Design a protein around this nucleic acid. Structure first.
Lengths: 142, 182, 263, 126, 59
RNA sequence: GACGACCCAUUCGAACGUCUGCCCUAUCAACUUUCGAUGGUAGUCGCCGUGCCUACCAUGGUGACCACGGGUGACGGGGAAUCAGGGUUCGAUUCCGGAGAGGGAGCCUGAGAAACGGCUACCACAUCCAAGGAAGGCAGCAGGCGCGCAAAUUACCCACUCCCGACCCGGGGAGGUAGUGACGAAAAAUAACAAUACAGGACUCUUUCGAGGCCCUGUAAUUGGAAUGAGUCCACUUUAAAUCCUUUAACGAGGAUCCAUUGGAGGGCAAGUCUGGUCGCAGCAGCCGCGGUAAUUCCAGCUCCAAUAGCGUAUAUUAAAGUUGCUGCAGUUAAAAAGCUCGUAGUUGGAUCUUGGAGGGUGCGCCGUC
């Protein structure tokens, strides 16, 4: 029970807990403010940038495909980031020097699937929603 | 500007057994949605929790006495609850139908003046039903005991009297302009 | 803040016992400076238009007041937010009504009509008793009235029948075991009762064990006890209820029994 | 269809020269009623006449055939004209008065501020 | 390690012969639709003890 | 019928003083004073207490019960969210207390201000000019730029609620009022009832065939009568005046509508042992995994499911998580008992001192029970 049991010993128990909390990764991340300091997105949920170039990335085994992302300079901190472009032929819709709204995978910062070193996805261009673009609700305005 | 939610969804989402149960409730009870059921599963859980707390308290305990009797009296005014119940030991052993049974909709069936939990809801939502001086359009209502008798069609909706119907009255003048003259 | 006296009251930060609603606006009246502390008072506006229903607007309350319609303790008061309080009289003449501001058993200034006499006099609790300037002595009552030359028996916490036209104490009651009492603050605010005991603390804080005409016992701080006469013999009107205090169950038992049948 | 005007919760209020009460208007089955019809109709129950029975509030209830409001009837037409909200007297053919609408006037005054005392000067400028 | 191509981008979407929309019915408003569900599912819905059956079956 | 004054108390306060409770950090362990650090003593100062300041005179005060130093997606609290219980996290933000009005510093007035819708200097910014001069501070209300993931009218009124003034009367972007407004929360429409017509099942009768029969649901066939606001609109209400709501004459439901959506249907996971197309391609896929020619995962339809005027997606954080474990963890081998012992703080500590009868609450028909 690895832990005193004296009526007094609040301070030891209280503090021993403070000492071990660290190992928790979610906890440490939060106390070290990692999201502000290391992370490309601010510690925000979405982030907008300009498209530098279009990449065809080489999906990891045992899968085999050309992935199709763009490389993006985030306006907020000039950070360089590669982001996936989802659905069929949607690259089509984003051109070099584009602008785009990027969002996390939903993986906690950890890349997704077979898609290697890509941690973000495009959501908007034409300020304009790949979904609405892919469907043809709305266009590549211009 | 204070506000609160009135319903709670179930922890979990796909438990055939629960889904069927809810569907039977919607059907018997001319309900509209799962929320319609969820709202009541929620109403009930709070009542039961209110009950359970009380039941853990000492009897005669000014707090247990004063609020227990009140919860009971409230639960009885609406007919939801009955006397032997009408103590806390019995609310603990209670269920959703008991509430669901007191809404308008099912009553307007329950005395002929609808012949369907169906008919009932469209009747209510369409202004042909007063609870004695007052139209009530809320198929969702909760008919209090000594209020059971005052439910009836309204003073003007046609049944309830009053001309015919913006569509019946159309039909009267539908046999009037052509078949009468030119 | 921080350079001067507040002039507004955010409603909601007003005292509960005025029972102003939650919606309506942002600000409550906020008592003028006067004879009663701001928490412990009842701005006329609340009396005229919040309890008595004579007024609707605040615009109306003012229109009433400028007539001169209303006197507090005998001497027309013309301020909307005048701070009236416990043992105050309030007399609306062309309407013939005399009211004494004294507590509910809730702890709410009660609407309590009194006779066309009585309205003459009020009972004040002595707060301090003083040798003023030139060697004269004075007493100071709760309601902030200073009377010189009082009679030498009168000591702090005693109460004192003031005339009212004239000022003038026209006797007194000592604070002694067995006196009738009115509770003017705290959990027990409004309960009336005999005494029993004063527990005394040096440094600070004296408690008064009170027993009611029902052998119900309770304590408050000496600060909260006001003497109003001799057991079974109040020196003023008491409101209906004789400051009794009944359990929420007893309260329910009275409410349903007196009506939906019992006349 | 007959109506019926019913005056609930009465107060004789001398210190504002008027009897003040709720107005409960049954209209069984249509809706409604005019403010003018209401004041006419009340005028004849309190032995007072129209021009002393202001009437206000009002909201027909739920579903039809009733409307609850509020009324006042004044003991001196003088007493009304003086205890009176002004907007109330304006509403019926006895009170009306000047508008603006307000920022033109504030602008005038702020123009006047520039000018030393005199200010009447600023009046001729507005 | 990327080099490669995209020539083929969007090859199936662009090769998938479009289909009409056809049409037909409206399905029903709120509670009424719940009612049809409950009768088709449960009243309907009698079931057999056929060792079961299905919702989106062909033959 | 139109305010001053002295002094005292009062009221609203103010300014200080008591304790007890605060985040992370030791890759911060000794700190604080010759420009007072702690104390004496006296004065000057202040509304006043006080190293506030100053002289002289002492050499103090604090720390492993975390001081000192540093950091900070720290204004503090009432509160909020997450519900076994324990807990876990947030709190700028409708109240309270504190702080500031471009940055810094100073000051006048006055009872109250170290005020910025006062002033004054510098410092940073910006503006007018006939170039000598001169005038300014939206972390007030609107609005605008920049910023970004992200946030409304350059609208009406002092009638309500209150405030101020010489004031019943004036004035209030306080505040109300409308406009924008799927933060989010409540109510819950887009169709109900027969009939034929049929499709059917427990019931009964019959040896069976077969027939009757109640409860009815669909499903058409159209019927058939039976309906209501969503819109629209005399009138009226609302209110300062309006709007909307809550009110209603005249209109407004046969479906091709007065036309409901958004995700899913291989497993977890609710729902295609589909049809066309492709053939580890495009795509799908949080995870496991699908697709390399009969693809129930794709791409489309068809059909079906689920939540439904809402639903998907991303993200902080919480629940789940007894994966931070007080309650309530594990450590022989899985991630984990220091090579061993001494040992201060800290924690932890044997036995033993004093031995029915009645009053009041709610059940059951004067009796009693608990």
């Amino acid at each position: 029970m690895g832990k005193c049991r004296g009526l007094r010993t609040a301070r030891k128990l209280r503090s021993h807990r403070r000492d071990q909390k660290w190992h928790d990764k979610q906890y440490k991340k939060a106390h070290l403010g990692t999201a502000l300091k290391a992370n490309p997105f601010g510690g925000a949920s979405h982030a907008k940038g300009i498209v530098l170039e279009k990449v065809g990335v080489e999906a990891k085994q045992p899968n085999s495909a050309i992935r199709k992302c763009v490389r993006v300079q985030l306006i907020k901190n000039g950070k360089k980031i590669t982001a996936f472009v989802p659905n069929d032929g949607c690259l089509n819709f984003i051109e070099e020097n584009d602008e785009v709204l990027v969002a996390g995978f939903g993986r906690k910062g950890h890349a997704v699937g077979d898609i290697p070193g890509v941690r973000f996805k495009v959501v908007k261009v034409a300020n304009v929603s790949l979904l609405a673009l892919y469907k043809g609700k709305k266009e590549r305005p211009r | 500007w204070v506000c609160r939610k009135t319903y709670v969804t179930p922890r979990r989402p796909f438990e055939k057994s629960r889904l069927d149960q809810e569907l039977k409730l919607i059907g018997e009870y001319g309900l509209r949605n799962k929320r319609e059921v969820w709202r009541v599963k929620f109403t009930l859980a709070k009542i039961r929790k209110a009950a359970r707390e009380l039941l853990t308290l000492d009897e005669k305990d000014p707090r247990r006495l004063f609020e227990g009797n009140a919860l009971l009296r409230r639960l009885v005014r609406i007919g939801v609850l009955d006397e032997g119940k009408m103590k806390l030991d019995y609310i603990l052993g209670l269920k959703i139908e008991d509430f669901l049974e007191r809404r308008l909709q099912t009553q307007v069936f329950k005395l002929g003046l609808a012949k369907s939990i169906h008919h009932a809801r469209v009747l209510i939502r369409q202004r042909h039903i007063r609870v004695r001086k007052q139209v009530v359009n809320i198929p969702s209502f909760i008919v209090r005991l000594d209020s059971q008798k005052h439910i009836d069609f309204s003073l003007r909706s046609p049944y309830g009297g009053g001309r015919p119907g913006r569509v019946k009255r159309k039909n009267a003048k539908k046999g009037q302009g052509g078949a009468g003259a030119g | 803040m921080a350079r001067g006296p507040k002039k507004h009251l955010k409603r909601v930060a007003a005292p509960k016992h005025w029972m102003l609603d939650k919606l309506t606006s942002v600000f409550a009246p906020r008592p003028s400076t006067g004879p009663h502390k701001l928490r412990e008072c009842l701005p006329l506006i609340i009396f005229l238009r919040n309890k008595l229903k004579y007024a609707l607007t605040g615009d109306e309350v003012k229109k009433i007041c400028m007539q001169r319609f209303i006197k507090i303790d005998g001497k027309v008061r013309a301020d909307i937010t005048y701070p009236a309080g416990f043992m105050d009289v309030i007399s609306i003449d062309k309407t013939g009504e005399n009211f004494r501001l004294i507590y509910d058993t809730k702890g709410r200034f009660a609407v309590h009509r009194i006779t066309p006499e009585e309205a003459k006099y009020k009972l004040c609790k002595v707060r301090k008793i003083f040798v003023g300037t030139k060697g004269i002595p004075h007493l100071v009552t709760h309601d902030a009235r200073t009377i010189r030359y009082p009679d030498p028996l009168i000591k702090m916490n005693d109460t004192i029948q003031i005339d009212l036209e004239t000022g003038k104490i026209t006797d007194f009651i000592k604070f002694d075991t067995g006196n009738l009492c009115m509770v003017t603050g705290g959990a027990n605010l409004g309960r009336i009762g005999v005494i029993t005991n004063r527990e005394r603390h040096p440094g600070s804080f004296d408690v008064v064990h009170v027993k009611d005409a029902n052998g119900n016992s309770f304590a408050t701080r000496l600060s909260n006890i006001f003497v109003i006469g001799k057991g079974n013999k109040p020196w003023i009107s008491l409101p209906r209820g004789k400051g009794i205090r009944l359990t929420i169950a007893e309260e329910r038992d009275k409410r349903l029994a007196a009506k939906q049948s019992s006349g | 269809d007959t109506v019926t005007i019913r005056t609930r919760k009465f107060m004789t209020n001398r210190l504002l020269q008027r009897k003040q009460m709720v107005i409960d208007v049954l209209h069984p089955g249509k809706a409604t009623v005019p403010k003018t019809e209401i004041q006419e109709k009340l005028a004849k129950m309190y032995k007072t006449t129209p021009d002393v029975i202001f009437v206000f509030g009002f909201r027909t209830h739920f579903g039809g055939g009733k409307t609850t409001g509020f009324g006042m009837i004044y003991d001196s037409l003088d007493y009304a004209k003086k205890n009176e909200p002004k907007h109330r007297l304006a509403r019926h053919g006895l009170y009306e008065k000047k508008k603006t609408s307000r920022k033109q006037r504030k602008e005038r005054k702020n123009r006047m501020k520039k000018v030393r005392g005199t200010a009447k000067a600023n009046v001729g400028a507005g | 390690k990327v080099h490669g191509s995209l020539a083929r981008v969007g090859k199936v979407r662009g090769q998938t012969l479009k289909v009409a929309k056809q049409e037909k019915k409206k399905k029903r408003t709120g509670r009424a639709k719940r009612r049809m569900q409950y009768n088709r599912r449960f009243v309907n819905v009698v079931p057999t003890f056929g060792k079961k059956k299905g919702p989106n079956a062909n033959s």
